[PDB]
Amino acid sequence: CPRFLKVKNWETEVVLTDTLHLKSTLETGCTEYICMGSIMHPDVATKDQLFPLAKEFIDQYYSSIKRFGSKAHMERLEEVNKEIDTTSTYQLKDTELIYGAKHAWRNASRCVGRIQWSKLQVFDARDCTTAHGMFNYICNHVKYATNKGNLRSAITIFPQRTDGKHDFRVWNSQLIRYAGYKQPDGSTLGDPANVQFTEICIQQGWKPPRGRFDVLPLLLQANGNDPELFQIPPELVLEVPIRHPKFEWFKDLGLKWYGLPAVSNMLLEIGGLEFSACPFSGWYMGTEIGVRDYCDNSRYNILEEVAKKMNLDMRKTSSLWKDQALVEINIAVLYSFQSDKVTIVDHHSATESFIKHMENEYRCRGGCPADWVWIVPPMSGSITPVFHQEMLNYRLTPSFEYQPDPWNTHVWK
Amino acid sequence: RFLKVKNWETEVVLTDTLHLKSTLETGCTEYICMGSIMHPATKDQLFPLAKEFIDQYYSSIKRFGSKAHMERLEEVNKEIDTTSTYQLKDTELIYGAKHAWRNASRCVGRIQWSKLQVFDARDCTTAHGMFNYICNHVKYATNKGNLRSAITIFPQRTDGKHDFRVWNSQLIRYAGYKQPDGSTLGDPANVQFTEICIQQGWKPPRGRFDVLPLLLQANGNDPELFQIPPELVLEVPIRHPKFEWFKDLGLKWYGLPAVSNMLLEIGGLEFSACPFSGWYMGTEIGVRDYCDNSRYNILEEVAKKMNLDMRKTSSLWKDQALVEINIAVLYSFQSDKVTIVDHHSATESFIKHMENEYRCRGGCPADWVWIVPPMSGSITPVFHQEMLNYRLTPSFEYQPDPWNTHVW
Ligand code: HEM
Ligand code: HEM
Ligand SMILES: Cc1cc(N)nc(CCc2cc(F)cc(CCCN(C)C)c2)c1
Ligand SMILES: Cc1cc(N)nc(CCc2cc(F)cc(CCCN(C)C)c2)c1
Ligand SMILES: C[C@H](O)[C@H](O)[C@H]1CNc2nc(N)[nH]c(=O)c2N1
Ligand SMILES: C[C@H](O)[C@H](O)[C@H]1CNc2nc(N)[nH]c(=O)c2N1
Ligand SMILES: [Zn+2]
Missing domain, CATH: 3.90.440.10 (Nitric Oxide Synthase;Heme Domain;Chain A domain 2)
Incomplete structure (x- = not known):
């Protein structure tokens, strides 16, 4: 694989250089002959499988704290090694565990909010x-x-897998x-x-x-x-009841949503250890609710009902009656949330923040994996700065799986 | 392997066998994906490329291994031999260009692929x-x-010099x-x-x-x-159906979208000059041309005339301005009997087209990044449709x- 890779921003001509892709650990699904970039989803570890995985993580941790090759580093390695050898697994220090969870967030290519990655509260529930x-x-x-x-933002981390049956x-x-x-x-x-x-x-x-x-x-x-x-x-x-700053009738739709976005089905992998229960939470981007929860045909599907109350032509598709109702729903979601002082970020702010974040990452870390397909908001895409941003996507560990x-x-x- | 694509809204699954037929690289490796990167011959190089193409021509017309097929291969061989290139039959020229449209992973209009008017200008x-x-x-x-829809095809490359x-x-x-x-x-x-x-x-x-x-x-x-x-x-004067102030903006666009800088490739021949044209999806003009910051950049101006609150991004004024701008664009073309497709219809047709392609051809290469309209993404049916991308030949490069x- 080639050393340096280039990404271009087609709106600003800015060209960043990616050296970090070289540290890629696992598979993307893609091959030379086919790309799966739009595919949503493309019994335990043995000793000899775990040794190199663990060392990799440790070395990484000790390179972060600027103690690589130190006495504490070599001693940690020997301890971890002795522990896999005898108990078939090992245990992470509180420091290692916290570094690892922040780093799996930081490495989460599908996440537009990673500028906050370092501010994460980690609750050890092992x-x-x-x-x-x-x-x-x-x-x-x-x-x-x-x-x-x-x-x-917080994560709570339960005990790591052992034999799969527990x-x-x-x-x-x-x-x-x-x-x-x-x-x-x-x-x-x-x-x-x-x-x-x-x-x-x-x-x-x-x-x-x-x-x-x-x-x-x-x-x-x-x-x-x-x-x-x-x-x-x-x-x-x-919980936030959904009202509109102009349409008095919007609260008549009887719509509310929860204020806490909190994923609890993903598996956190750190140093080769599998944390099958690791709920994490942050705060919402407006579009998650305004566009997906509310408007998707197989979700709440309120587009037609909001269109009606808006008195729109709904025979012609080219009247754009759908896109007009969509903007107005997302205007109400951001309004309701701000008026109840519940934290929420609009999709313009988030995408702008993420471009900033990505640039710092390229600068300091030599790269920043990203899934353009997931990163770009599900509404008004081209008018956000990420649309025009070229993004290399690869899988770094620790990660959420x-x-x-x-x-x-x-x-x- | 066979591969499966799922639409997450309808739960329909399709099986892709067609991807087996590609050879050109995509750019990705098992570890890095470049699905969002915009831009990732000799006698001996030329023959097998020519051979595969003829083979699939005579296979598409249900005469594989025919006498007609065999002499064509012979004709082509002797010709590359003695001239370091070869010329396409007219039937093959027409097939190659329709099929290069058909394999254009980034085109949402491809339901129309076979109604292509072909202008030979060799x-x-x-x-x-x-x-x-x-x-x-x-x-x-x-x-x-x-x-x-039409394409015009000028003489193929020979030596780079001409x-x-x-x-x-x-x-x-x-x-x-x-x-x-x-x-x-x-x-x-x-x-x-x-x-x-x-x-x-x-x-x-x-x-x-x-x-x-x-x-x-x-x-x-x-x-x-x-x-x-x-x-x-x-050209079309852009005007709004409800906003009588819109015409004063002074906006017009041209009716004919026609890409002239690409390179058609058939049987290992390089047509460096092959302008093709169809008709516009509304968003091409309403969103990209008019509203990019590096293009015509009118959102500020429109939202002003629309009298929106432009102090905070979270009032989504840009998202309002955008929808009204695209309404006007559709309404102007429609009022002038100039052809145009809105992004809801163009997407439906595409999903229908995908179904067709899978049903009779075992797959349909698509670039989700390009296929999804640059506005109102998830309220169109292609956002939820998984797509496999791979490079079939003939192609536009x-x-x-x-x-x-x-x-x-
Ligand atoms: C702090 C505020 C945060 C914001 C604004 C944010 C934003 C987002 C958004 C909009 C998505 C797409 C959601 C979807 O379409 O389903 C996403 C996905 C994701 N985020 Fe974040 N996020 C935040 C915090 C976090 C934290 C704390 C973590 C992990 C520690 C995280 C990791 C992820 C992961 C792994 C995904 C992919 C989910 C999947 O594959 O289903 N995010 N994020
Ligand atoms: C007939 C109606 C057609 C419609 C509605 C249509 C629609 C579109 C749209 C919206 C794009 C995205 C371009 C962009 O946003 O920059 C595109 C790309 C493309 N189309 Fe079509 N198209 C049509 C006809 C054709 C024809 C006649 C050809 C060639 C024979 C063609 C081949 C392509 C190719 C190669 C691209 C990729 C552009 C690139 O890579 O820069 N399309 N099409
Ligand atoms: C941590 C975090 C922050 C944030 N702003 N958003 C999220 C996602 C929250 C969420 C909340 C939710 F209810 C459902 C989902 C995903 C549903 C399944 N997908 C694969 C189709 C996600 C998570
Ligand atoms: C054949 C065809 C049909 C259709 N509906 N649209 C097109 C594209 C028309 C077009 C016309 C145009 F002037 C410029 C572009 C895109 C230029 C490159 N981008 C990436 C900065 C495209 C081509
Ligand atoms: C098929 C496609 O991958 C799927 O519909 C994706 C597209 N992009 C997405 N992007 C985000 N942020 N969330 C999603 O659920 C999806 N869905
Ligand atoms: C970086 C990324 O490839 C670039 O912004 C792409 C995204 N999708 C696109 N889709 C279309 N139809 N046209 C484009 O110019 C682009 N630009
Ligand atoms: Zn890929």
Whole structure:
């Protein structure tokens, strides 16, 4: 592979040079003959597999703190090595764990918000043993992160995988989500995305209110055991009713959303250790709710209903009645959130911030992996600075990975 | 391997077998992906390239291994042998150009690929002949508003020394003038080229929408200026359906989109001059041309007349300004019976086209980065459609700008 690579910005002619792609660890899916850049998704580790993985991470950590080749560095290596040799695994120091989680965020190519990567609160929950213990740690995460609307990014990290039969998993894809109920007539109430999971919850014992914005319970699995339901204290779930600064009728749509974006189905990998339960949270970009949650045809799909109340021509597609209703929904989402002092970033600010971030990364780190397909907002793309930015995408470790859905793999006791 | 693509909205899955047929590299490796990078012969090189092409021609017409097929291979062989190149049959020229359109991973219009009008201009020898050939393309392809797809093909490369090149990247584009005060009149994307025309003796009207003259190079010779007759250049006054103040903005665009700087490649032959044209997707003009900061840049101005709050980015004034600008663009073309496709319709057609391609051809290369409209992305059905990109041949490829390699 070639040493230096170039990326161009076609709006500013700025040309950056990427040396970091050389440290790529795993596969992208692409080959010389085919590219999978638009493809969404392209039993444990043995000793000899783990040794080099771990050393790589350690060396990396000691090169960050400017102690590479030091006495503490070589001594750490020998300790880690002795530990894999005898126990088939090892354990990360609190320092290593915190560096590793910040660095998996920093390396997350699909994430437009990584300018904040270094400010992340890491909650070590490796001492956990039960679902109640999990429910407790998560509740504290929610309360810390939410901070009364002044959100703060945090991760809570549960015990790492051992033999595969003793995983900790959060069964909810995200900590806070709205239920979805299939009707007998085929129509759906709530968030259609979450139907399968809502059914699981109901079978597992949940009594559903059967409403449009019913907050799902946590379903928590510890040490390989069957999952258990716990409801989140509603006082811990900050929520924003959606109104519009011009249209008085917009609140009549009875729309709200949750203030905390919190991913709980991804696997954090550090030094070859697998953290199968590692919920993290930040704050929302306006478009996530205004465009995807609200407007996607298979989600809340309110475009037609907002169009009606706007009195738009809806026969001709070229009237652009859809794009007009879309902008106005996203105007209301940013308005509601700012007026309740809940932290939220518009897609112009975020993309501008990210270009800044990327440039500093190229400067200081010799590169910054990025997934243009994910990075570019799902509305008004070309009018944001990232659209015109060339981005090399590759996978650096530590990283956040996808993992199978637990209800597909779990062995019921 | 077979590969699968899923649409995440409909959950439809398609199976790609076609990708097995490509050979050209994409740029990516198993470790680095360049899906967002814009720009990632001899007798012995020439024959197998020619052979594969003929093979798939005679396979597409269901006469594979025929006597017709066998002599063609023989004909082509003896010809490369004794001439270091070979000429395409007319049937093969037409197939090669339609199929190069068909393999254009970055084109959303490809549902139309087979209704391509093909203009053979391989008997051309001067810049004057080119100009006459181009005028005819423009005039046919414009057709009084009812746009039709066409391509014109000038003689193939031979030795690099005698290349045919249209120097305009597009047959019709507005001029760009640098001002003493730093700013730019006309089109800022064209400013260099405009000054190469002026340097060649073009008299610029120094205006915001001055059609640039043709700069044609024939057989490796110096380029020569030529004005397209105005009656062949259809343009549209851009006006708004509800905003009666919009016309006062002074916006017009040309009706005919026509890329003239690329390079058609068939059976290992290089047509360095092959202007093709179809019709516009509204966003091409409404978003990119008018609203990029390095283009016409009118969002500030429009949102002013629209009287929006322009103090904070989070009031999404740009996103409002943008939608109204694109409404006008569609409404102007439609009102003038000039062909245009909106991005909702062009995307639907594409998804339908993909279905067709998979169904009968086992795949359809697509560049998601380019296929997704530059506005309202996820409310079009292609945002949610997974696409595989790979380079099938014949293809349209890029080439060095002429003024970087030509000696006078
Ligand atoms: C601090 C505020 C943050 C903002 C504004 C932000 C922004 C975003 C956005 C808009 C997306 C796309 C979401 C989607 O389309 O589903 C995303 C994805 C992602 N973000 Fe962030 N993020 C933030 C914090 C974080 C943190 C704290 C982490 C990890 C520690 C993280 C890691 C990721 C990852 C791994 C993805 C990809 C998700 C997937 O593949 O499904 N982000 N981010
Ligand atoms: C007939 C109606 C057509 C429509 C609606 C259409 C639409 C589009 C659009 C919107 C783009 C993106 C270009 C940009 O944003 O810069 C594009 C690209 C492209 N189209 Fe089409 N097109 C049409 C006809 C054609 C024809 C006749 C050809 C060739 C025979 C063609 C081949 C291509 C190629 C090669 C690109 C890639 C441009 C590049 O790489 O710079 N298209 N098309
Ligand atoms: C950490 C973080 C910050 C931020 N601003 N946004 C996120 C994503 C939040 C989220 C919240 C949510 F409810 C669903 C999703 C993804 C749904 C599945 N995808 C693959 C189609 C994501 C995460
Ligand atoms: C054949 C065709 C059909 C159609 N609807 N649109 C096109 C492109 C028209 C066009 C016309 C034009 F003047 C410039 C461009 C893009 C120039 C390069 N970009 C990346 C900075 C494109 C071509
Ligand atoms: C098929 C395609 O990859 C898929 O629809 C992607 C496109 N880009 C995206 N970008 C973001 N940020 N989030 C998404 O869910 C998607 N979806
Ligand atoms: C860097 C990136 O490749 C560049 O901004 C691309 C993105 N997608 C595009 N898509 C179209 N249709 N036209 C373009 O010029 C671009 N530009
Ligand atoms: Zn790729």
